[PDB]
C-alpha cells in the first residue's frame, strides 16, 4: 500500500476552522449552506463589479511532519461572468493558489510577499444562471502539488482577483 496521510482537511472541521482573510472586511467570507441534506461550510467571495480586487485567504499553519512533497485537492464552484450584466471587464473566472513555508507560526501576521504562486486554478464547469437559481452546484476538483518542503511548517493561500468563487473543500496530503 501507498497510504495517504492527511495534513489539513477543511470540510472535515465542520465550520470550526477560521482562516485569516486580508483585507479584513471586504473579500473572502465563511458562510454556511445546505447541500445533499447536510450543512456545508465554504469560503466565498463575489466582488465581480469593482475591478481592483486583491483578496487573500490564508490557511492555518500546517505542520509538515515527514512530508517532502504535498498534494492539494481543491473543490470549488465558480459562477458564469456572463450571468452579470455590466461585468464584462471586471468579472474573472479564476483564482490563484499560493503557498509559503516557515519554521514558526506567524499568527495574524500576514505577509503576502513571502508567498509563491503554485498555479492559476480555473473551473472546467462554470455555474450558469439557471443552475444558480435552481440551487444546483457545479463542483470542480483541481489537484496540484509542490516540491520539496524544507521548513517545519507551511501555509496555503487563495488570491481572488474579481471572480465569483465558492471554495468547499481543501485537502492537503502526502503519499507514504
Amino acid at each position: 500500500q501507498g497510504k495517504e496521510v492527511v495534513l489539513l482537511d477543511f470540510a472535515a472541521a465542520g465550520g470550526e476552522l477560521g482562516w485569516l482573510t486580508h483585507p479584513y472586511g471586504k473579500g473572502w467570507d465563511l458562510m454556511q449552506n445546505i447541500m445533499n441534506d447536510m450543512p456545508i461550510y465554504m469560503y466565498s467571495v463575489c466582488n465581480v463589479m469593482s475591478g481592483d480586487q486583491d483578496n487573500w485567504l490564508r490557511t492555518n499553519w500546517v505542520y509538515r511532519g515527514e512530508a517532502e512533497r504535498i498534494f492539494i485537492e481543491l473543490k470549488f464552484t465558480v459562477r458564469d461572468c456572463n450571468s452579470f450584466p455590466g461585468g464584462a471587464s471586471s468579472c474573472k473566472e479564476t483564482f490563484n493558489l499560493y503557498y509559503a513555508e516557515s519554521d514558526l507560526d506567524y499568527g495574524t501576521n500576514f505577509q503576502k510577499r513571502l508567498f509563491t504562486k503554485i498555479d492559476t486554478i480555473a473551473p472546467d464547469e462554470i455555474t450558469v444562471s439557471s443552475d444558480f437559481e435552481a440551487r444546483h452546484v457545479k463542483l470542480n476538483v483541481e489537484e496540484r502539488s509542490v516540491g520539496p518542503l524544507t521548513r517545519k511548517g507551511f501555509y496555503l493561500a487563495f488570491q481572488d482577483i474579481g471572480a465569483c468563487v465558492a471554495l468547499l473543500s481543501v485537502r492537503v496530503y502526502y503519499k507514504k
Partner: antibody, heavy 128, light 108 residues
Framework: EVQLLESGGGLVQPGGSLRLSCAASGFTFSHYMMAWVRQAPGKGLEWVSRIGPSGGPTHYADSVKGRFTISRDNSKNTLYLQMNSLRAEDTAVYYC?????????????????????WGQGTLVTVSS | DIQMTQSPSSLSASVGDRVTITCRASQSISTWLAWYQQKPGKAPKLLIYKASNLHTGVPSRFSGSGSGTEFSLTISGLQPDDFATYYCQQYNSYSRTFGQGTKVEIKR
C-alpha cells in the same frame, strides 16, 4: 430605469374580491422573480407571495394561503394578485417587488430571496 | 417560524452621528439577511443583503454585520435624508419574515 406600477387598488366589502396589477418596464421581466409585500396602515412590512420567472414555483404566507392567487403574463410584462374572501385585516398598501439573480453577487444562492426593486404600491381598503 | 426582532424600536440621532441598529433572529439564519429603508408614504428600498453586501447605488456610509443570530446596521455620519424607518428581512426560510422596524428620529 426598472419601473413597477401597481394598479387595481380600491375599496371592497368584507368577503369581496379584487385583482391587483403591476406593469413592469425597463427590463427583461421574464428573468425576474416577482413578489407581493404588503403594509397595513401604521404597521410593518409583511411578505405576501411570490412566483418564479417561468410562472414557476409559487409560495404564499400562511395568512393568505387558499384565498390569494399570484400569476404573471411574461408577454405583457405584468404581475397579478387575485385576492378572494377579503377581511378587514387585509387592508394595506400592496407593493410589487422583484429580484433578479444577475445583480445578486454571491457565489451560492440563499434559500429564500430578497427584494431589489419595489413599486410605489396601491391601497386596498376592506371595509363595510 | 423564524421570528425577527429589531432593537431599539425608536432611536434619536443628530446629523453627523454614528448610529447602530440591531436585528436578532430567534434561530439561526446564516448570513441571509437584508436591510431596507422606508421614508413615510414611500416604497422601501434595499440597502444591504448577504448580511453585509451593499446594494448597487447605496452610499458606503451604510454597513451591516453579523451572522447566525445577531446582525447590525451602522450608519456613519447621518445625513438629513437618513431619518427614516429601517427593516430587516431574513431569507433563510420560505416564510421571509421581517422585523417590526426601527425609526431613526432627529434629536433635539
Amino acid at each position: 430605469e426598472v419601473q413597477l406600477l401597481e394598479s387595481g387598488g380600491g375599496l371592497v366589502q368584507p368577503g369581496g374580491s379584487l385583482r391587483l396589477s403591476c406593469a413592469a418596464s425597463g427590463f427583461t421581466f421574464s428573468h425576474y422573480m416577482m413578489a407581493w409585500v404588503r403594509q397595513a396602515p401604521g404597521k410593518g412590512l409583511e411578505w405576501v407571495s411570490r412566483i418564479g420567472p417561468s410562472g414557476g414555483p409559487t409560495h404564499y404566507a400562511d395568512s393568505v394561503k387558499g384565498r390569494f392567487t399570484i400569476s404573471r403574463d411574461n408577454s405583457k410584462n405584468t404581475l397579478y394578485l387575485q385576492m378572494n374572501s377579503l377581511r378587514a385585516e387585509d387592508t394595506a398598501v400592496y407593493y410589487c417587488a422583484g429580484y433578479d439573480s444577475g445583480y445578486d453577487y454571491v457565489a451560492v444562492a440563499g434559500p429564500a430571496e430578497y427584494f431589489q426593486h419595489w413599486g410605489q404600491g396601491t391601497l386596498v381598503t376592506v371595509s363595510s | 417560524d423564524i421570528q425577527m426582532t429589531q432593537s431599539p424600536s425608536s432611536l434619536s440621532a443628530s446629523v453627523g452621528d454614528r448610529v447602530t441598529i440591531t436585528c436578532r433572529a430567534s434561530q439561526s439564519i446564516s448570513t441571509w439577511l437584508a436591510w431596507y429603508q422606508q421614508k413615510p408614504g414611500k416604497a422601501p428600498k434595499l440597502l444591504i443583503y448577504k448580511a453585509s453586501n451593499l446594494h448597487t447605488g447605496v452610499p458606503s456610509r451604510f454597513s451591516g454585520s453579523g451572522s447566525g443570530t445577531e446582525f447590525s446596521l451602522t450608519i456613519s455620519g447621518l445625513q438629513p435624508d437618513d431619518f427614516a424607518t429601517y427593516y430587516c428581512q431574513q431569507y433563510n426560510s420560505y416564510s421571509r419574515t421581517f422585523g417590526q422596524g426601527t425609526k431613526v428620529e432627529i434629536k433635539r
